[PDB]
Each structure stands twice: as C-alpha cells, then as structure tokens.
Design a protein around this ligand. Structure first.
Ligand SMILES: Nc1ccn([C@H]2C[C@H](O)[C@@H](COP(=O)(O)OP(=O)(O)OP(=O)(O)O)O2)c(=O)n1
Ligand SMILES: [Ca+2]
Lengths: 956, 353, 352
DNA sequence: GTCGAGTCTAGAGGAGCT
DNA sequence: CGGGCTCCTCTAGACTCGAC
C-alpha cells in the first residue's frame, strides 16, 4: 500500500489511488524532479526524513463519470436538475397584470384572470417569487406576503392582521407561519423570507431550495466594502457603472434600469403599528407587489449571467445546499439569554456605581472655583443656569383642634398648587448643577430614568477625567484632532492649570521612586495646551491612529504594568478595564442574539426518534433557528450572517460567549462535523506546487506545509509559533498577514503587541528575518498574481469568474490586493461547494438519516441521526478525501499525499462548541455546560477509529 | 474609630464607647441600637423580605417561637432553621405538595458568648427535589450575593467562599471585608433530608413532595443571613463626613426646614408638606420644630452624618411662587423645585434607586 | 369553635387540631401562627406603627433587648416598659431635652404561665406632671378610636377606668369576645417613680424642659397585645366568610386561570401577578394549580381565607381582555378590562 | 422674532469571527 | 497595502417645531 512521491513524500495508498486516480499514471519528468530537488536543497529542506503514516485501505463507492471532475459534474447535475427546471419555467412565464384590489381574507388567496381573488390552501406551484413583510412593532411574526407563480398571483394575510385580539402568544410556533407546502422559491434576500415558512422548521427536510438574487448579484458584479464606500460617496471610475449596492433599488437600476424603484416614505412596517397597517392595507400590498415584480425582473436578468460566469454545476448545486442551514435549540436558549443579560446588568451596574461616585464627589469642586486647579476637570463646562419663571406645654390638642389644624395645613398647601402657572411649559433640567453634569443625568421625562449621572460609561470622554487617569505620571488629556494623549508638564513656550500638573508629577516622581525628559508618540504642538507638551498615546495599530478610549483591551497590559494608573488607586482602574473586557462582546451583540427568531416545534411536529428517546423531557421545549445566511455576501462569494458567522467562542472571561454551545441537538440526534486543517494554507501551497513543477511539495513552502502534524506540534502554524514565540492562534494571523501583503512594519507591530517581552528592535529584526526569507513562497505569489493580472481571473478549480467590478479592464491596477486574495478565498468557497455536493450525494446514496446544519467557512456540521454518527463520520472523511483529490486533479497533479487526505478529527458532539473538550465556563456560565445543562463531552475520532467502528462500510 | 463616634452621636448605636467595641458589636452584647439604627435595620429587613418572599409564588412566612419547649427544661433558640422544619408538613397543604417551596423568617436568635448575645437573622428554608439541589444552591448563592451587592457602594467587599461540612455536605459562605478582616454575614447549606427524617420519624410517605410527576423526599437547603452584622457592614460601607447609605436603606429620606418668618403661614405650609410626605411613605425629619437656629453649614453637616437624602427649605418666598430649596446629599448642589411636584420627584427618586 | 377550625385549616393558626385551645391562644402558649396569621399580625403591627409613630414628631422607635443581664443570672424581659426607661436619658438628645416625647416599640414579652410569649405594642410618654392626666385621656381616646376603626362592630371594643394599688389612675380596653371581655390594652399614669428609682442621684439628668423651667417627667404607659387583638379581629370578622378589613386582610386578590390553552393563559396570569405585586397588592397564585376544583369551591375557599377579590382569566381574556371579578363582601360577579384592574384595586383599598 | 429641546444622520473608533 | 465582513456606542453637526 505504501507509495512515495519522487521527492520522498508519502502519497495516497495504493488501494485508494487506484480507486480515485486509476492506474496508468505517467512517469514524472525527471528534469522537473531534479529541479525540485535542487530547489529543496537550496533552502536546506531536502534529505529530512518523515515517518510513514499508517496507510489506509478503504472500499470507496463507485465514482461514476470517468474521473473525478465528471463524477462531481454528474452529482451536481442530478442534484440541481429539478430546481433549474423550475427556474427555467419561471424565466419563460407570462404573468397577468398585478390585481388592483387585494383580498383581505386570512390565508393564501389566488387571483385568477381579471383579478378574481380565490381562497386556496397553498400555492400549488413548483416555482415562486416571494416576499414577506413583517411588522417590527409586534414582533417577528409574518404580516403579509405576495407570491408570483408562472400562472397566477398569490397573496397571504395573517390572523394577527385580519383578526383583532387583546393578546397574541409571544412564543412563535409553526402554526402562525406561511404554509408553502421539489419546490424552488426565488427572492431578494430570501433568507429572511425562508425563516417565515412553516415547513422549513421540521427536522425532516422537505425538498425545497431557495435562490437569492442578492447572492447572485454579489457573485456577478459584487463590490468591495471600500468600493462600497466609494460608490456610495459618488452617488478610473468605469467600475461604478457595472456594479451596484445590494439594495433592490440599486440592483434593479443596474440589471434592469427601468423606472426608479420607490419605497414607502412612511415605513409602516419598521416605524409603524398594526393599526397603521390595517389602515394602509392596499398601499402596502401594492408596494409588496412592486418589489416582487422588481425581484422577478432582476432574476430574469441575472440567471443567464450567473450561469455564464459560474458555469460549473457544482457552484449552483452547493449554493442551493448552503441555504438550508438549520440550528436546533431548546429551552436552554432562554436561560442563556436571561443569564447573560443579568450578568451584563450586574457588571454594568457595578461599573456605574464606581463612576457615579466619582462624578458626585467632583461637583463639590464647584464651591470656591476649585476645579480651576484640577488637572482633569478644568476644561469642562462648570456653568449654572438660572431658574426660569414666567413656650410651655400647650397640652393635648382636642379632636376639633386636630381636624382644624389638619385641614388648614392641607388648604395652605393646596392653595400654592395654583402657582404652577408661572412655571414654563418646558421643565428645566438640573439648572443648579454644572454643565458637564446635566448631560450625564437622564431627563425626568425618560421612561428609563435613574437617579444620579446614570448615563456615565467608560467610553464617554469625561470618564478618563473623573477617574483621574494618568499615564506615566502625566494627566490624560483629549484633543479633538489626535484622540487621547497626556500633558507632560514643565513647558515654558478656563486656562489649564500647569502648576497643579507640575506638582502632581513631582509627587509621582518622588513617591513612585522615579527621578525634554520624555519620549513618546511625540509632542504634537498643534494642540498647544499652555505650559505643557501633548504627547499622544501609543495605539496598537501604529503612531498614525488615534486612541478612541484609554479603556481599550490593549491597555490592560499597560494598566497592570504601572504606566496607566487611576487617581483613586488600588484596583479601581484594573477593575474598570476588566469589566469592560468582560462585557465588550455582549454590549454589541445582545440586540442581535436576543432577537433571534426561534420557532418552537410542538410535540406533534417532532419525529418519533425524538419523542421515544429516554432523554426526551416531557416538560422541555425544542425549537430551531434558521440562520439568515446570504449564501454569497462577499466579493469572494463567502456566506454572510451577522450573528452566527460572528458568534464568539467560549472564553473564560467573556460574558455571553457560550452562544454556539446553546445549539444543542434534539434527543436521538447528534451533531457530526469537522474543520478543514489549514485550508487556505494548503490551497496556496498546492497552487504554488502546480505552478512550479507539478508535484506535491516541489516548492519549499509546499514541502514545509505538507511535512508535519498538528498533534505533534510540527505543523507550519505551530512551527512558526515556536519560531517567533507566539501562540498558534496568533501565528495564524502572523502568517496570513505575511501571505496577504502585510509589510514588515505590520509584523513588527504584531510582535510588539502579542509578545510583550519583544521590544521594538527585537520585533523588527525577527520580522526582517522572516520576510527576507527566489524565495520559499515565491512561486505561490507568482501564480496568484498571474491569475489576478489575467484578463478574466477565474478560480482554477471550478472556473467561477471574478466580479465585473474587479476586472483589470475596468480597474487600472487598483484594488490589486483584494483581487489576489479573491483567488484563495474563492478557492475555499469552491472547496465548500464540493464538500456539500459530495456529502449530499453520500447521504442520498447510502440512506443516512441526517441533514446539513451549518457551515462556518472551514467548518461543516451535519445534524445526523444518533445511530448513523459513525457512518456520517466515514462519509465526511470520504468527502474530504474526494475534495482534496479533485482539487489536485483540477491543478493537473494526479496524486494526493496521505497526510492531507483525511480529517484530523471528526467531532461527534451535541453542541456547536469549537472543541469537544470544552466546558464553556464564562461569567454568564460559571458552573459549565455539564453542571448546568448536562451536556457530556463528545468524541473526536481519527480516520482509523472511524474505519474500525464502521468496518469501512458506508452501508448499514 | 470616627465611624463609631458618628454612629453614637447620630443615634445609630446606643451606650458608651466602652460598651460599643468591635467584639461587642459582632457578638450581640451591645446595649442596643439608636432610633436610627432601628430604622436602618427595618429597611434592611424590608428589602430582604421584598427580594425573597414577596416576588415568589412559593415562599411563605413562618412563625417559629423564641423558646424550645421541653427536653427537662426549655432553652432559647439558636437558629430559625429548627423551627421552620416543624412546619414543613403543614405547609405542604398550601403548595398542594408541589416542590420546590420555601419558608422564610426574620427573628432574634440567642447565642452563648457567660454572656448572652442576640442576633437578628433572616433565614429561608428551601425544600427542593434531591436532583436539583446543587442547581438551587448555586441559584440561591448568586441571588443572595447579588442582593448583598445591590445596596453596596463597593460590591467587591462582599465575597463568597465554597465550604464543606463534616458529613461532606456542600455549602457556601458570604463575607464582608471589614477593615480588620472578613466576617461571616450569610451561610447557605445543602443539608439533605437527614434533619427531616430525624424530626419526622416513621413512615416517609408523609414527607413526599412532588418533583413533577415523581414523589420524592425533598433535600433541605438553608440560608441564614445576619441583619445586625449586615447593617454594620452597610454602615462601614457607606463611610466631608457623610454616610452614603443607599436611598432604599437610609433611615430618614427628607429633612424639612423654615425661614425666619412669617412663622404662622410658614409653619402651616410646613405642616401641610410634612403630612403630604408622610402619607406617601417618606420618612421626614421635623427640622422646622428645632428651637435653635444654626448656620446652614452646621445643619448640613448634621444632616449628612445622618444619611438624609434631601434637605427641603421652606421660605417666605414659597408663599408667593411655590418654590422650595432642595439640596442633595450626594452632590451638595441646591436646586429649586415647585412645592407641588416634590412628592412625585421624591417617590421617583426612591423607587428608581 | 368553627372559627378556630377554619383558621387552623386556612393556615391562620399553625399546629395540630388538638394543639389549639382558647386558653392557649390567650396566654401565648400555642404552637404559633400560619402564614395567614403571620401576615395578619404584620398588617396589625404596621397599622399600629403608622397610627402611633409615623405621624407624631415626638415619638421615636426604641431598641430594647429580650434578656435583662446583671444581678437582680439573666432574665427575659416581661414588659417593654423597662427597656424604654433605660433609653430615657440618652433619648433626651433627640428632642434637645424638650418635653413631652415618647418611645414606642413592638416586640416580644415573655410571661410565665410554661413560658408564654406575647408580642406587645407599647408607648411610654414622658410628659411634665402638669398635663399628665390630659395626655392620658388623649391617648385613651386615640387608642380606643384605633381599635374601633377596623372593627365591623365597634361596640364590642369598650373601655373602663381603674385605680392602681398606689392610687395611680389608668384605663383599660376590652374586646367583648363571645365568652366575655378580655383585656387587650391598658393605660397607666405611673409618675416618675421608676425613672427616679432607675436613676438615683443627680436628678439633673432626668430634668426635662417644660417650656422654660426644668422638671422630671411623669411617665404614661400604653400597652396592648397584638396577638389578642388579632384574635379579637378574627372573631369580629366571622355562609362561612371572614370579612376582615381591607387594610388587615393578609391576601387581597386571588388570581386564577379557568380555561385552555394553559401556556397562553398562564403568561397573562403571570404578567398580571407581577403587575399587582409591584404595586403592593398581596396576590394568591391560584393559577399555578394543575387540578382544578369547582369555581364555587374556589369561591368558598377564598372567602374563608379573607381574600377581597377573585380574578379569573379565561379564553375571552385573550380576545378582548375582560377578566371575571368577584367581590367577597357583595358576592357579585362582574367583567372588567385587565388594564383597569390594578387601579380599581388600589382605589378600593385606599377608599376603606 | 427668537431660542432651546427632540430627532436624524454621518463619521470615528472598538470589537466578534473566519 | 493583511484581507473579507458584521454591528455597536459616542459625538458633533444640521434641521425642525413649539413655546417665550
Ligand atoms: N486572521 C485570519 C484568520 C483566518 N483567515 C483565513 C485563512 C484560513 O484558511 C481561513 C480559516 O481560518 P482558520 O482559523 O481555520 O485557519 P487554519 O485553517 O490555518 O486553521 P486550522 O488549520 O486550525 O483549521 O480563514 C485569514 O486569512 N486571516
Ligand atoms: Ca480551518
């Protein structure tokens, strides 16, 4: 079984190479082999021996087609046929005019000829153009929808719109969604519209696929984010006429160019109420129909161009599968939300106490104008606005005396109540407090009013002044042109008190043990605070950036070091930094996470496997979140989702960062998945190898990438990390910056940021050594730039073209870095498409009960049946093998090394956590997953364990 | 200590300096509390009751007697736990044998010191299914610690410590970082059903509580706060000499005053306002009855040492335009407010705190 | 008999059926009170506090310990009077030695019978001897008014004059229980004797400012049993319905649920329950029950528990928001909007 | 007629992920 | 020339509308 490359690389075993690449491989060019050996020994890499990995014998399923490419093309065609048929039928359809009067009934209504509305249970069509309107006021329920069929027009109205009721249940169920059922549903940003179809939430997958015109626009003529900013600012420059923003207005104006598409100015769904929508029903339905028609036009103008520029059937057959993502949740989701919000509120309230105390004690400086000598609160607005206008014991009182005194005091009090008329109708807000203090206190009219300066936070520009922060014995100071700095005293060229600052620095230098005398980011004398020098704070991104807050996570090392100190002293500044670092993520992401649309499956909708499992709680609720993924949201055609592709991994200190761990498979199901090992690194290495000599590891970079393992710690990431001293997860950033055009200064800054021990000189020397290296990775760079500079850059594997906005004909040498990165990133997207096609083929062929769950780029999760976890793991290993072999085949290599042929580990867990051996202990989850929710640690299996468990057979 | 002098002078404590030492205050041998310490402790008890008993469908009050009758002769109770267990079977009729449920109490417990010390302690006895005992213990640990930290100026002084019993029973211990050291203010114990079976010998079908569809003998959990040491912790926490007690814990909220004249109309207005605030649950210090007229600086210092949230000054001008002078303990900034709106602002300030 | 059976069953009087006795309830030697009895006594104590301490600027709370150490070998306190006198000298600082002023307390007092403890409400009034009898009559009138205020039949709360063994005048209050009049409060004009005894020599400390001159003040003791007052009001209130006063009844509104779906209707019930509690209305969470009894049986049970109103949430409450509202006193059923309920209840409690 | 509060928007800087 | 994205809060400017 053992086989070797001409450069002594253990290649794929005989029993697998014969089944995949077939016999008859030509002998490699001996001149090329000698050239590669000379190149390897030029950099001192030839002659290093590697251990022979145990060869794998496996009976692969029949790869019909003739070779790998034909096999994948046939799979993609057989998967995408019934939906391409429906899309074609949509393209060749004549539609009657939009009805003038829309039905008001509840449910689906079909408009026959002459606009005759007819109640129909569901659209009896295999192809629809869809749009769902949602009233944000009430919640996340669908409000109304209009659908376009090849024959008729359809409209949908909900109970919560046609029917009035005091209360509607807040927990969504599939009984208040849109019933749409080999169906195809077309729409612009159809991920939003998919989430409101009731059959998309069952575990058993109905054969429905969704086509997105937003994704097709991004594929055909997408635009970079910087190019997005330039295009918006305007609204060579020829690209501004072949590309547009992702709005249906701009997309329609680009592809179709008809009369401008008009949106409703009132925004009765975003900023309106249910009564406002019952009032303007016909207007909103007609706007919905106009948008559906614009989507139909854009689809007609887009389907040809997409198949022209993305002609491989695998691209579409994978984009169809990448839009049926499915996350199952349970009652632990609500617990997670409540616990994370409560912990966030606790820590925020602690910090607010600490700051509001400092605010209140500073108002006492107003008496006597003492703030003028405060080196922090001297430049604030300390103004007061005036109020505006238009005997011996008598004895026990008798009862009549009691009543008379009571009533007369009451009347004396109530007669003054009439003097309210002299008060202005606008109530003044804290006129007796200084100016900087009124702004911190919410007005009494606010529904969330709290006593004191309740609006204070660490990001405000007064907090580094109320905390009396100092940097190296210098008071912090803010300039409107340089961000935060500090006032180095002793310069001789409300006023700034410079004698107070000199006294403060003298006290610091005589107490701490210290001694024109300072060197820092530089005396930017444009600020010109009299009597002192304004030195800027050093920012982690360089000396050109501005620090937006001295409480950023890059200052905690400087805080603990002793340069950045708080005035109160002790653990006040460190605790402020720690709490900010703990609540940074949830502060941004709580509106996203808490507003996810969860639909709770009733016990009737759950399958028998779930309901008969001994772990099925009769009191718990099981639901599902359909991620609203845009299957192509970048110029590189990556998927985009604001929450789940941005979800944080469980950190020990981050609040709410156990988000993905709350995606827990239902009883009877397990989550089988794997992560591609050094995906883009191997892609770049194999591209360089195919460009250099046509053998794996012919280049020095390819040989370095290929030789090693992650477990042994001898892989390229770990080797680089040990070489520099940084962690592997930061060696990723370091090497990826090196590949993606980062200069040596970036490496210097990265080393100084990560490895605090390394000074400027050491980091600069190491960066120069590692970038100086006719280099180790020169062939990969040359091939990537050759692909980028060609007339029509295409992916070497599937052939998908670059966006028309990024061709060299329309751009005269600009945005070149984005184009060169597009090659590798779109190659990764092609890898993902191939994996999805192959996994779907294997599941269909060998009768594995499971469905695609989610794919966060390099990762791919499948909600497989519990009994099919090992067959699914074997299928995942086989698909990785075939994807790598196809990648090699399309590059003309005809062989695959054994090291990269299989997944390092196929995780079989009941959560979406990164590693199986993780308890996900965060401030919001201090006990852990197992203690609180009862999630046992899963198992990660290698290829050999999977073969031993499955006997190497996918059939069972 | 200056704080103890302030507490004696401002009638938070009682007795002489010799009678009020750290050990006597921490034991219960102090002569008692002043009229302000009584109200601060009442505020603590009210907040504890609100947090624990009021907003729970399952927590009920319980009446445990002060003396332990019978075996030869009786004694004085040392904890409220023992008396609460005697009501477990009777209180299963209220919850219809549903679990979990609780019994809560605030009372004085007598500890040998041979001197005798009295402590005001708030206890919750939580009967939970044995499978959920650890999760309920963690829940109550978090709930109690956040309740203690809620009114604190420095919540980091309150801490927690996971402990263990002689019988290997998991527990917890809260603390307050007093200037000398850490002192135990609360203790949560996962006792189990040993005490229930010892107290109720015989058939255990009498003790069965419904864990959903499964009857089970509950595991007992006990929480035992310390209200006397709690208010001493808050007096040390709050402490220009000012006691920055929480707006919900400050014994006195507002302090009324007067001008020089006209006395007959100003005193009628002040009596009307005084009755207005008392009818709305705002404790008032009748400073307009004082026979001695002092500089506003001295009066302000006196009111700050007593934790007075606001100082209301009614002058002859109030008779014309209805405006009063309002001062704030926290900021020392004087504002003008119409006398008709004062009660609403004060209720807003106390509730929103 | 029937009343005590109801009270024990409805958790007014905790303990065994045989363990409850008339003389055990009138002596403090009883197992204790159920949660309803505890909340009723808490209501009574709050009413006493508001009507004595809160509105009077001369009255301050006092902190007396349970035990009395030192040679007389400690001793449990038998009355709240002596602990108040020990605070007399140091509590002249609150009023700047100005007379009159008072010290009021509610606490437990241990009476030998067996040790039978009674929770008593006391007020010691330090007044100059000139106006002692006038203040005694004033307090007598006010205490009688307070006791009669909540009574459904205020004719039973009588009063009488008495002479002490030392010739000191005083008054006594009695509730006319069905078996006879039991003493629920007593007022005494004991003058200075004790203040001097407890403080022999240096009467300059005991002197109080009776206007301009300084005098030693006569003390007045008003002492009333809150436990026997609770018994008196339970007998006053008591078809088996306990018509306790709205300000004394432990639980005001009994919240309930009546139909399906369970999870949609219990969210409404929980929201209403949280709203009512935030405004200081005691609610009985009857909606948590899984096994539903007859509506008439719930009405009888809640009438026995002195719950003012019964609120029923049904299917219709989801459509138009109307809840069923039943009044304990008038046994009248009506429908009102759920948003109007809290204001209605607050105004009803305030009106009484 | 003029002036201050509510609103609305846009830019800067920080922070998640791959 | 690290790249591609996503979203958040804080601040300053501009505009509008009602009240003196
Ligand atoms: N700072 C980063 C992080 C990631 N990526 C790209 C390159 C990777 O190929 C891809 C996936 O990131 P991974 O973290 O998976 O990088 P690796 O695949 O090298 O990690 P591993 O080998 O552990 O899968 O994203 C990048 O360019 N820059
Ligand atoms: Ca990877």
């Amino acid at each position: 079984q053992l086989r070797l490359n001409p450069l002594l690389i253990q290649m794929l075993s005989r029993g697998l190479h014969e089944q995949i690449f077939g016999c008859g491989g030509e002998m490699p060019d001996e001149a090329a082999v000698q050239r590669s050996v000379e190149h390897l020994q030029k950099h001192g890499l030839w002659g290093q021996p590697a251990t022979p990995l145990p060869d794998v014998e496996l009976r692969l399923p029949r790869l019909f087609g003739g070779n790998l490419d034909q096999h994948f093309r046939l799979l993609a065609q057989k998967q995408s046929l019934p939906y391409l048929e429906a899309a074609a039928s949509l393209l060749e359809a004549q539609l009657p005019p939009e009805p003038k009067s829309w039905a008001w009934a509840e449910g689906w209504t079909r408009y026959g000829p002459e606009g005759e509305a007819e109640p129909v249970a569901i659209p009896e069509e295999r192809a629809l153009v869809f749009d769902v309107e949602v009233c944000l006021a009430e919640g996340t329920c669908p409000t109304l929808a209009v659908a376009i069929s090849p024959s008729a027009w359809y409209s949908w109205c909900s109970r919560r719109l046609v029917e009035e009721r005091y209360s509607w249940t807040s927990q969504l169920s599939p009984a208040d969604l849109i019933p749409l059922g080999e169906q195809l549903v077309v729409g612009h940003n159809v991920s939003f519209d998919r989430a409101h179809i009731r059959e998309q939430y069952l575990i058993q997958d109905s054969r429905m696929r969704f086509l997105d015109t937003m994704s097709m626009h991004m594929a055909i003529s997408g635009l970079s984010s910087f190019q997005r900013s330039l295009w918006m600012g305007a609204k060579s420059w020829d690209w501004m006429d072949i590309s547009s923003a992702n709005n249906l207005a701009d997309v329609h104006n680009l592809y179709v160019g008809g009369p401008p598409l008009e949106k409703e100015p009132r925004e009765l769904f975003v900023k309106g109420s249910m009564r406002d929508i019952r009032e303007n029903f016909q207007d909103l339905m007609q706007y919905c129909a106009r948008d559906v028609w614009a989507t139909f036009e854009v689809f007609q103008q887009q389907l040809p161009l997409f198949l022209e520029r993305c002609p491989h059937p695998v691209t579409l057959a994978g984009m169809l599968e990448m839009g049926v993502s499915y996350l199952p949740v349970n009652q632990n989701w609500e617990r997670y939300l409540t616990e994370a919000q409560n912990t966030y509120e606790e820590l925020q309230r602690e910090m607010k106490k600490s700051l509001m105390d400092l605010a209140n004690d500073a108002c006492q400086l107003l008496s006597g104008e003492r703030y003028k000598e405060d080196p922090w609160l001297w430049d604030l607005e300390w103004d007061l606005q005036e109020f505006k206008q238009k005997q011996e014991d008598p004895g026990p009182p008798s009862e009549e005396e009691e009543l008379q005194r009571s009533v007369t005091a009451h009347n004396r009090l109530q007669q003054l109540r009439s003097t309210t008329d002299l008060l202005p109708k606008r109530p003044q807000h804290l006129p007796g407090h200084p100016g900087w203090y009124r702004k911190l206190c919410p007005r009494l009219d606010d529904p969330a009013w709290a006593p004191g300066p309740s609006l204070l936070s660490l990001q405000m520009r007064v907090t580094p002044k109320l905390m009396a922060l100092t940097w190296d014995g210098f008071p912090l100071h803010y300039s409107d042109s340089h961000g935060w700095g500090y006032l180095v005293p002793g310069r001789r060229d409300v006023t700034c008190p410079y004698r107070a600052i000199e006294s403060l620095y003298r006290k610091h230098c005589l107490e701490q043990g210290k001694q024109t005398y300072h060197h820092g980011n530089g005396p930017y004398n444009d600020v010109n605070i009299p009597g002192c020098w304004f030195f800027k704070l050093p920012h982690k991104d360089g000396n050109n950036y501005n620090v937006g807050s001295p409480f950023a996570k890059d200052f905690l090392p400087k805080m603990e070091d002793g340069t950045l100190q708080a005035g109160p002293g002790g653990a006040s500044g460190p605790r402020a930094l720690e709490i900010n670092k703990m609540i940074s993520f949830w502060r941004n992401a709580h509106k996203r996470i808490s507003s996810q649309m969860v639909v709770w499956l009733p016990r009737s909708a759950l399958p028998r496997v779930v309901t008969r499992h001994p772990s099925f709680d009769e009191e718990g609720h099981y639901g599902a979140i359909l991620p609203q993924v845009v299957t192509a949201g970048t110029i590189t055609r990556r998927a985009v989702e604001p929450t789940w592709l941005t979800a944080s991994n469980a950190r020990p200190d981050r609040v709410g960062s156990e988000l993905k761990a709350m995606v827990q498979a239902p009883p009877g199901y397990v989550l089988v998945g794997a992560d591609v090992d050094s995906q883009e690194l191997w892609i770049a290495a194999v591209l360089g190898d195919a460009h250099f000599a046509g053998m794996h590891g012919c280049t020095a970079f390819g040989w370095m990438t290929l030789q090693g393992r992650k477990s042994r710690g001898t892989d390229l990431h770990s080797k680089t990390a040990a070489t520099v001293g940084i962690s592997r997860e930061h060696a990723k950033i370091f090497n990826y910056g090196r590949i993606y055009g980062a200069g040596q200064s970036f490496a210097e800054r990265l080393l100084m940021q990560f490895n605090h021990r390394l000074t400027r000189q050491e980091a600069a020397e190491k960066a120069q050594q590692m970038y100086a290296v006719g280099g180790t990775e020169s062939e990969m760079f040359n091939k990537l730039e050759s692909i980028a500079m060609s007339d029509t850059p295409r992916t070497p594997v599937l052939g998908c073209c670059i966006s028309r906005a990024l061709e060299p004909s329309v751009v005269q040498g600009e945005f070149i870095t984005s184009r060169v990165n597009w090659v590798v990133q779109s190659s990764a997207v092609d890898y993902l498409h191939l994996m999805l096609v192959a996994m779907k083929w294997l599941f269909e062929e060998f009768a594995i009960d499971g469905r695609f769950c989610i794919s966060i780029h390099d990762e791919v999760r499948y909600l497989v049946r519990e009994e099919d976890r090992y067959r699914a793991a074997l299928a995942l290993q086989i698909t990785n093998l075939l994807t790598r072999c196809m990648f090699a085949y399309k590059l003309g290599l005809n062989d695959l090394p054994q090291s990269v042929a299989f997944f390092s580990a196929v995780d079989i867990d009941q959560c979406l956590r990164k590693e199986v051996t993780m308890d996900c202990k965060t401030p919001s989850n201090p006990t852990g997953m197992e203690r609180r929710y009862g999630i046992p640690q899963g198992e990660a299996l290698d290829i050999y364990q999977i073969i031993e468990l499955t006997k190497g057979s996918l059939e069972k | 200590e200056a704080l103890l002098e302030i507490c004696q002078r401002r009638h938070f404590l009682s007795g002489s300096k010799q009678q009020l030492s750290r050990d006597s205050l921490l034991s219960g041998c102090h002569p008692g509390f002043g009229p302000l310490g009584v109200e601060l402790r009442k505020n603590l008890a009210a907040e504890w009751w609100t947090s624990v008993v009021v907003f729970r469908e399952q927590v009920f009050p319980v009446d445990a007697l002060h003396h332990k009758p019978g075996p030869t002769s009786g004694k004085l109770r040392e904890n409220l736990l023992h008396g609460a267990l005697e009501h477990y079977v009777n209180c299963l009729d209220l919850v219809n044998k549903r679990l979990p449920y609780g019994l809560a109490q605030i009372g004085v417990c007598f500890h040998p010191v041979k001197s005798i010390g009295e402590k005001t302690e708030a206890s919750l006895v939580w009967f939970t299914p044995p499978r959920t005992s650890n999760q309920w213990l963690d829940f109550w640990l978090r709930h109690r610690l956040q309740w203690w930290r809620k009114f604190a100026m420095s919540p980091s002084n309150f801490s927690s410590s996971d402990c263990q019993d002689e019988e290997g029973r998991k527990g917890n211990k809260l603390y307050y970082n007093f200037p000398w050291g850490k002192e135990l203010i609360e203790t949560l114990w996962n006792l189990g059903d040993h005490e229930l079976l010892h107290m109720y010998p015989g058939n255990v079908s009498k003790l069965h509580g419904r864990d959903g569809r499964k009857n089970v003998v509950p595991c007992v959990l006990s929480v035992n706060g310390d209200l006397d040491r709690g208010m001493l912790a808050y007096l040390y926490d709050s402490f220009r000499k000012v006691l920055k007690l929480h707006p919900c814990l400050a014994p006195i909220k507002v302090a009324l005053d007067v001008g020089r004249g006209p006395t007959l109309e100003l005193r009628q207005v002040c009596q009307g306002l005084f009755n207005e605030l008392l009818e709305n649950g705002i404790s008032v210090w009748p400073g307009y009855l004082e026979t001695m007229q002092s500089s506003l600086e001295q009066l302000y210092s006196k009111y700050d040492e007593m934790s007075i949230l606001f100082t209301v000054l009614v002058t002859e001008t109030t008779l014309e335009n209805g405006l009063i002078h309002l001062r704030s303990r926290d900021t020392t900034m004087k504002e003008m407010m119409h006398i008709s709106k004062l009660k609403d602002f004060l209720i807003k300030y106390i509730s929103s705190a």
